[PDB]
Specification:
The protein is of the alpha+beta class. Helix content is about 25%, strand content about 15%. A hairpin with a 4-residue loop joins strand 4 and strand 5. The longest helix has 22 residues. Bound molecules: a molecule of 8 linked components (NAG-NAG-BMA-MAN-MAN-MAN-MAN-MAN), ligand Y6I, calcium ion (2 copies), chloride ion, sodium ion (3 copies) and zinc ion. The site of one sodium ion has 5 residues, from loops. This is Autotaxin.
Length: about 800
């Protein structure tokens, strides 16, 4: 109950929320059905509309008006945004040439440049080019400020997960808003778009920007707007807040538009009905910028124009139905649409089996438009697993499609022509970023980046220390004129050992064999140097990775490759090698097919053994440095060392062998040499972070050889590809992957065919940032380059998406 008989007199859009049953006057009171009786009358005035006219100029103040054209309005902070244009002969902001803003130009008493976040729902990245004719205000922000060709949203590419990611810097799995709809099994409560439960604070994890600001003594406007408050009123409220006394005036503000998303759902992303919504958004931006100019704030405020996600063409007829796959359809609950999430309808049903459900949904129809996954097998780049609100069974739905349980769900629950929620690498889901103000750069284009990075930057803009988050602080320093964040490289925690020859062959009883006993100061002085690290400069181009946790490991040097070998996990944490454009692929000689060789630098007790692999009927092995790429027949013996060996299922060896035999050479040809760092990843609890030894759920049968959940590779070359990878004077180019180490290839419906028809497609799906690999390994790469650290952090956050041009 609310005692709605209080009054909003002088309280309109109050910044502090009053505790019920006292009636409210803040911009959210409508949503809670809690506004005072006179809120509409006093706070949502519409009389005379939103614009000054020639004859309204100089008028006598009439408090009933929506905005004012009287002489006193500027000091009152409540003129219509076009007052000075109409009445004082000013130009609109958009008609003014842009001029570099080298310093904040602010009224006296402003302690810092305010930040205004202008967020647009469903604003697809290609609207910037495609709608540019009808968006002159936005086009001026974009060309005069700092802009990216697009910004990558988080998965799922829905509204709430993305807006909350913008506010927190966290993946949805960490912030807890994992969809627009959710069931939390611990609360036993459901979260929905409509309804009351979503207002409960227990759903919302991490620390959003307005809380970060408040705690650190920076005042914030209220970020959320009830839908029925028109856009013109949102703008005038912000402009009014900016006229408050110094001690009361917020420093950070947000505006939200439900457009163009709202019309996009109805008409598709490029429906002819989409032009009007883009015009209206531009007009709103114009109103803000005119209002700012009037207040002498247009060269003071930093403005961010940002979207939550794009919009794709999707129609009713493009729906897959689980009823065409499952016999047991009524025993499941599906969260439907542009993603699928499945759980048991009843926790009392002991005959529910996720394994049989997954199998029934796997590669069943020729052009099947969704792929089922256990959540821990989803591409690691989605970071979509580590939350109890994410169901074990997930469906990744093809762009342009929906999944639903039964046909009746679609026509008894065509309306829409657009939707979103798909994989966050999909071009149509990409959204926008523009930064304009004294703190952003002038007329600068920056590369695409992820929206998880923005929280840090908004903190930088306000002089705040960011709460712990998933951005990489410093990676967006190149967007900023000043207020950059200058991080230091993390300190290495464990130093390596550098073992020499310490064991005789006969001390090893590993069950391993090799036809290598076939016999000189030319070549023996030479081989000793290689084992002391003489070629290390060629194969370790960016310094050795730093180990950021406590462990015991050895550096092992070889002619063709260098490794950091873990005595704890009994295999390399990383193996580094360079393959020049000129390098040649050779085969594994017949006599060496099953050769595994003891490493006389590493004790038997810290080695793998071949007997375990023989005994384990499910597990085989592969090598991190590929024997195919040995520099000479004698160097090839090094690739068969037991310390270069790692556990691999036969199904996975198909993937790995093709990558090593074919793909590495291909990238070296195309990229003018590559440097490759490969290694294992252990993430049994799917938290995106390196597992400790006591977290490993699987070993090679009868041994302490732990089985990786994933295998990574980081592939680096010169951005200027006229320079060879090992002789690069400037910026680097990277692509990486984190391949799931699976005992079957069920994920690839074409896997019965030649590796050339399905393996590269698998790898592209499992594309990754170096940063993702750092989290998963506790390693820190690119420690020794001639590049600035900020540039390297940008490089580490890069994602190669394999999408065509936006
Ligand atoms: C992306 O960035 C984020 C932010 O940096 C990273 O997430 C952090 O990861 C940390 C390392 O895992 C984690 O640290 C743990 O915190 C525990 C206390 O956490 C509470 O307090 C913080 C601070 O205010 C708060 O943020 C947390 O909020 C979480 O939980 C609530 C309620 O569930 C949610 O509302 C909220 O959304 C958020 O949930 C998310 O995180 C939790 C994990 O905390 C997940 O379970 C959820 O799925 C969701 O993703 C909390 O309110 C602290 O107790 C931990 O310490 C235990 O574990 C360590 C192991 O190192 C051990 O040393 C300790 O002894 C202790 O163990 C004891 O408890 C164990 C479990 O009960 C038990 O097994 C043992 O036997 C012991 O009894 C730990 O320090 C930190 O909380 C999160 N922060 C956030 C915001 O998520 C994230 O890793 C980044 N991702 C990537 C890929 O880089
Ligand atoms: O005013 C608001 O939010 C401001 C804001 C702006 C920016 C924020 O973060 C930032 F500041 F960091 F950017 C930041 F948290 C918060 N909101 C939240 C967004 C929202 C969603 C809906 C909604 O019902 N749908 C969404 C579109 C859609 N598509 N398909 N189905 C749907 C259903 N209504 N609203 C209005 C109230
Ligand atoms: Ca949205
Ligand atoms: Ca882990
Ligand atoms: Cl959802
Ligand atoms: Na031998
Ligand atoms: Na085996
Ligand atoms: Na298959
Ligand atoms: Zn939408």
């Amino acid at each position: 109950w609310t005692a709605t008989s209080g009054s909003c007199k002088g309280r309109c859009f109050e910044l502090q929320e009053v505790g019920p049953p006292d009636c409210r006057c803040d911009n959210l009171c409508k949503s809670y059905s809690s506004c005072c009786h006179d809120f509409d009358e006093l706070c949502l005035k519409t009389a005379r509309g939103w614009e000054c006219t020639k004859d309204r100029c100089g008028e006598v103040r009439n408090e009933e008006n929506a905005c004012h054209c009287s002489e006193d309005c500027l000091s009152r902070g409540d003129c219509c945004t076009n007052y000075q244009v109409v009445c004082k002969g000013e130009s609109h902001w958009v008609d003014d040439d842009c001029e570099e803003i080298k310093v904040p130009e602010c009224p006296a008493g402003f302690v810092r440049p305010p930040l205004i976040i202008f967020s647009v729902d469903g604003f697809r990245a290609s609207y910037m080019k495609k709608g540019s004719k009808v968006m002159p205000n936005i086009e001026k922000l974009r060309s005069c400020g700092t802009h990216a060709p697009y910004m990558r949203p988080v998965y799922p590419t829905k509204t709430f997960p993305n807006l909350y990611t913008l506010a927190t810097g966290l993946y949805p799995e960490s912030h807890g808003i994992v969809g627009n709809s959710m069931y939390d099994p611990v609360f036993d409560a459901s979260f929905h778009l409509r309804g009351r439960e979503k207002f409960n604070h227990r759903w919302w994890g991490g620390q959003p920007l307005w809380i970060t600001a408040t705690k650190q003594g920076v005042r914030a406007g209220t970020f959320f707007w009830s839908v029925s408050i028109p856009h013109e009123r949102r703008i005038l409220t912000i402009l009014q807040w900016l006229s408050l006394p110094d001690n009361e005036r917020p420093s950070v503000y947000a505006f939200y538009s439900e457009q163009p998303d709202f019309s996009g759902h109805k008409y598709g992303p490029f429906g002819p009905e989409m032009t009007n919504p883009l015009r209206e958004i531009d007009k709103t931006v114009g109103q803000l910028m005119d209002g700012l100019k009037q207040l002498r704030l247009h060269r003071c405020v930093n403005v961010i124009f940002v979207g939550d996600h794009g919009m794709e063409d999707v129609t009713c007829d493009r729906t897959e139905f689980l009823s065409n796959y499952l016999t047991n359809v009524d025993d499941i609950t599906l969260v439907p649409g542009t993603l699928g999430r499945i759980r048991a309808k009843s926790i009392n049903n002991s005959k529910y089996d996720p394994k049989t459900i997954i199998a029934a949904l796997t590669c069943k129809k020729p052009d099947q438009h969704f792929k089922p996954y256990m959540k821990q097998h989803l591409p690691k780049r989605l970071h979509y697993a580590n939350n109890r609100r994410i169901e074990d069974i997930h469906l990744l739905v093809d762009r342009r499609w929906h999944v639903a349980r039964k046909p009746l769900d679609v026509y008894k629950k065509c309306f829409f022509q657009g939707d979103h929620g798909f994989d966050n690498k999909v071009n149509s889901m990409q959204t926008v970023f523009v930064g304009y103000g004294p703190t952003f750069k002038y007329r600068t284009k920056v590369p695409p980046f992820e929206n998880i990075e923005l929280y840090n930057v908004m903190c930088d803009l306000l002089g705040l220390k960011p709460a712990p988050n998933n951005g990489t602080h410093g990676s967006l320093n190149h967007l900023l004129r000043t207020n950059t964040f200058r991080p230091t490289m993390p300190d290495e925690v464990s130093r390596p050992n550098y073992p020499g020859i310490m064991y005789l062959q006969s001390e090893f009883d590993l069950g391993c064999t090799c036809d290598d006993k076939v016999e000189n100061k030319l070549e023996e002085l030479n081989k000793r140097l290689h084992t002391k690290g003489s070629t290390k400069e060629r194969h370790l181009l960016y310094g050795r990775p730093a180990v950021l946790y406590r462990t015991s490991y050895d550096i092992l040097y070889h002619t063709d490759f260098e490794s950091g070998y873990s005595e704890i996990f009994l295999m390399p944490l990383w193996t580094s090698y360079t393959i020049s454009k000129q390098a040649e692929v050779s085969s594994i000689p017949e006599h060496l097919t099953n050769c595994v060789r003891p490493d006389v630098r590493v004790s038997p007790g810290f080695s793998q053994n071949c007997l375990a692999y023989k005994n384990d009927k499910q597990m085989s092995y592969g090598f991190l440095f590929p024997p195919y790429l040995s520099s000479s027949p004698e160097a090839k013996y090094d690739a068969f060392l037991v310390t270069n060996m790692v556990p691999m299922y036969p199904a996975f060896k198909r993937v790995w062998a093709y990558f090593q035999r074919v793909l590495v050479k291909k990238y070296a040809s195309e990229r003018n040499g590559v440097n490759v760092i490969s290694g294992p990843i252990f993430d049994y609890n799917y938290d995106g972070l390196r597992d400790t030894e006591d977290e490993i759920k699987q070993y090679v049968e009868g041994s302490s050889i732990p089985v990786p959940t994933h295998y990574y590779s980081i592939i680096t070359s010169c951005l200027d590809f006229t320079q060879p990878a090992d002789k690069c004077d400037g910026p680097l180019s990277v692509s990486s992957f984190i391949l799931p180490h699976r005992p079957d290839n069920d994920e690839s419906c074409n896997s019965s065919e030649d590796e050339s028809k399905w393996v590269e497609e698998l790898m592209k799906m499992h594309t990754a940032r170096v940063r993702d690999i750092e989290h998963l390994t506790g390693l820190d790469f690119y420690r020794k380059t001639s590049r600035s650290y900020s540039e390297i952090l940008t490089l580490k956050t890069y994602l190669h998406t394999y999408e065509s041009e936006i």
